Design a binder for this molecule. Structure first.
Ligand SMILES: Nc1ncnc2c1ncn2[C@@H]1O[C@H](COP(=O)(O)N[C@@H](Cc2ccccc2)C(=O)O)[C@@H](O)[C@H]1O
Ligand SMILES: [Cl-]
Length: 124
């Protein structure tokens, strides 16, 4: 029902803020992106850059993906990201997350035409 590209934007793009403002960011954002619907998604990263800047990573440093495919790309620049990780006491359907704001390089896998991110591989 959802393209891979659209799922990437839903799970990983938050161009509306420049950083997580509070320790409640992940709690709110995981819910509003439907990442707590059926189960609590344990770990998820949001990127606080323009979509154009993130899509441009598909023309930057080509690297292998964790799965061994070679359509992964590392951002040349660091980007503003938020890492969201469920707490050890979190239990569905009251999913709870720790927020960690950082500036890091992102690694995404790209596919399709237009050649855009379809997977978030890691931050470094
Ligand atoms: N080279 C490839 N090209 C095309 N798609 C691929 C490739 N590698 C993995 N995917 C797939 O893209 C989907 C979206 O992933 P995400 O939900 O964005 N990332 C996982 C993290 C992850 C990191 C490494 C490996 C797996 C998971 C996550 O957010 O929890 C996942 O279901 C992957 O199987
Ligand atoms: Cl992978």
């Amino acid at each position: 029902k959802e393209t891979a590209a659209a799922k990437f934007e839903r799970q990983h793009m938050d161009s509306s803020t420049s950083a997580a403002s509070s320790s409640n960011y992940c709690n709110q954002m995981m819910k509003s992106r439907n990442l707590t619907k059926d189960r609590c998604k344990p770990v998820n990263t949001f990127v606080h850059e323009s979509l154009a800047d993130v899509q441009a990573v598909c023309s930057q440093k080509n690297v292998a993906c964790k799965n061994g495919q070679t359509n992964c790309y590392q951002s040349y620049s660091t980007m503003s990201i938020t890492d969201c990780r469920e707490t050890g006491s979190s239990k569905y359907p009251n999913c709870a997350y720790k927020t960690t704001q950082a500036n890091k390089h992102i690694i995404v896998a790209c596919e399709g035409n237009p050649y855009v991110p379809v997977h978030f591989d890691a931050s470094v």
